[PDB]
């Protein structure tokens, strides 16, 4: 393959929670994604969810279009049995290990992609829980973190910090879950993270948090933790198939390589 070109990991964020597309721009977006994905996005009752899903899809296609140089119209995205987006086996892809993943919680849709490292991502906004109080919420969530994890979570007198740590510990678990592609069906209590360092500054990728699966350290797993802003935590779980801050994209970035896929339809 003459036009080789060494590929590097991608870390993109898009603030969909403050993206306010016009009828025209949405329709642009909607036509730029795959038919099945259109219909789905169009089933979401709320802008919040539809925009996230949409930002997610536009970002994957951008990533493949740009990094794999497949013309957007010919990007064949699919999904594993358990719902993970994957690129079709038929290549335009001499990166057999090239994989990616998105998350969309809070105001952002984030995406990681790597050429070799198999990867999972999860973003989480520290927001007051939708039902009940924090303590109540944490109660509802007991069965999902280890005692040591909870001691760390309640180790802070401020319930916002507590929530911060909870969402962090959660995101770390999802990144891994999404990395391995398994779904909700994975007893999250099997996973214990040693959250390190406790206090994370914005504008920095922390690689120090190590994981224990079933009490044995999962030494084959790196975790990249950042706060893309003061309120969103992002975990990127990286396994070997055996520095880079997130880049805030805007709409035109998302569409830069877009070609319309589905026809005109009122």
């Amino acid at each position: 393959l003459y036009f080789q070109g060494h590929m590097e990991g991608v870390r993109w964020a898009f603030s969909c929670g403050t993206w306010l597309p016009s009828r025209a721009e949405w329709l642009l977006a909607v036509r730029s994604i795959q038919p099945e994905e259109k219909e789905r996005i169009g089933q979401f009752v709320f802008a919040r969810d539809a925009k996230a899903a949409m930002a997610g899809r536009l970002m994957i296609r951008k990533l493949v279009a740009e990094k794999l140089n497949i013309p957007w119209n010919h990007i064949r995205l699919q999904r594993t049995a358990k719902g993970k987006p994957v690129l079709a086996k038929d290549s335009s892809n001499p990166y057999p290990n090239f994989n990616f993943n998105i998350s969309h919680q809070g105001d952002y849709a984030v995406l990681a992609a790597e050429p070799e490292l198999q990867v999972g991502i999860d973003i989480m906004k520290t927001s007051f829980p939708g039902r009940g109080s924090i303590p109540e919420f944490f109660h509802i969530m007991k069965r999902k973190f280890t005692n040591k994890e909870w001691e760390t979570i309640r180790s802070f007198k401020d319930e916002w910090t507590q929530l911060d740590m909870f969402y962090r510990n959660w995101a770390l678990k999802e990144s891994f879950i999404k990395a391995i592609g398994v779904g909700l069906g994975f007893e999250l209590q099997r996973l214990e993270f040693d959250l390190s360092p406790l206090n994370l500054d914005i504008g920095q990728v922390y690689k120090e948090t190590r994981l224990f699966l079933d009490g044995e350290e999962e030494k084959e797993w790196a975790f990249e933790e950042s706060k893309i802003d003061e309120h969103h935590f992002v975990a990127v779980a990286l396994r070997k198939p055996d520095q880079r801050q997130f880049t805030i994209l805007n709409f035109n970035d998302l569409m830069s390589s877009a070609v319309p896929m589905t026809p005109e339809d009122p």
């Binding site: 089933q43 979401f44 009752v45 709320f46 919040r48 969810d49 919680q105 939708g130 039902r131 919420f137 509802i140 969530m141 069965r143 999902k144 959660w170 999802e174 779904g183 909700l184 069906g185």
Partner: protein
């Protein structure tokens, strides 16, 4: 308890819910992974109902109004 419907609305981050088709699925209303865990833990403790993920995803709010009335 009686209005579990609200409790899961609030879990979904929906408020009022007067402006929500009760026939919308929880998926369509934006059920997160976290939300999923909450809703499922709520229907356990409140309704003694353990639901598949698929079940919870396809739960309508009307289908909730049904499941609390029955008691």
């Amino acid at each position: 308890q009686r209005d579990l419907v609200e409790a899961v609305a609030h879990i979904l981050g929906i408020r009022d819910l007067a402006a929500v088709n009760l026939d919308s699925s929880l998926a369509d209303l934006g059920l997160d992974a976290l939300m999923s865990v909450e809703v499922r833990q709520t229907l356990e403790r409140e309704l003694n109902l353990v639901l598949s993920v698929r079940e919870v995803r396809q739960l309508t709010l009307r289908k909730l109004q049904e499941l609390s009335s029955k008691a």
